[PDB]
RNA sequence: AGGGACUAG
């Protein structure tokens, strides 16, 4: 089975009235869940207004996030990919932003081949290769939505053109 | 932004 990072949903901006059940009743509606918790205070067992859902296949989890808005007991949820706790931490973590940095692709990697990988994961405004002068081995993508990042970036590598290439949400400077 | 879980620290 699948790592878990990549099948699982933070869900903040929840009712303090939201229970696990009624979590796990509206997101079963795009799979099976392997796991849910509206996460409370350790003493008063008060809800701290987010929770997480894991469901089977990230598949599921695609459809769950093609399926936004979501709602539940009259509160706008807010669903996103759950970042690690080795993650949780630095800046960029749930900085939920539209761009993205891609390194470590050497001189023989072409704004065609990025495209090429990413279109997969949203769609694309905008490309760029960086030089001066060769080519520096880093580039910038821009998608539509942060959602196609938040994927992208559950993963640091990804192979492209014979690389390891690393991936990390664009900041501005800094 | 982590309660449980855990065959790469």
Same mark, same amino acid.
């Given at each position: 089975? *699948? %790592? !878990? ?14 229970? *696990? ?6 997101? !079963?509606?795009?799979? @099976? ?8 205070? $350790?003493?008063? @067992? ?13 598949? !599921? ?15 706008? =949820?807010? $669903? /996103?990919?759950?970042?690690?706790? *080795?993650?949780?931490?630095? $800046? ?6 539209? /761009? ?5 692709? %050497? ?11 990413? !279109?997969?994961?949203? %769609?694309?405004?905008?490309? *760029? ?18 959602? $196609? ?6 993963? /640091? ?9 690393? =991936? ?7």
């Amino acid at each position: 089975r *699948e %790592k !878990e990072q990549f099948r699982k949903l933070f869900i903040g901006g929840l009712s303090f009235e939201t229970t *696990e059940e009624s979590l796990r009743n509206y997101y !079963e509606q795009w799979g @099976k869940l392997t796991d849910c918790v509206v996460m409370r205070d $350790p003493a008063s @067992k008060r809800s701290r207004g987010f929770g997480f859902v894991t469901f089977s296949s990230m598949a !599921e989890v695609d459809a769950a996030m093609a399926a936004r808005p979501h709602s539940i007991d009259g509160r706008v =949820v807010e $669903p /996103k990919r759950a970042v690690a706790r *080795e993650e949780s931490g630095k $800046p960029g973590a749930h900085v939920t932003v539209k /761009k993205l940095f891609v390194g470590g692709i %050497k001189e023989d990697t072409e704004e065609h081949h990025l495209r090429d990988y990413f !279109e997969e994961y949203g %769609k694309i405004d905008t490309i *760029e290769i960086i030089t001066d002068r060769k080519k520096r081995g880093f580039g910038f993508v821009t998608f539509d939505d942060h959602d $196609p990042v938040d994927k992208i970036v559950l993963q /640091k590598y990804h192979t492209i053109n014979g690389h390891n290439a690393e =991936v990390r949400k664009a900041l501005s400077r800094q």
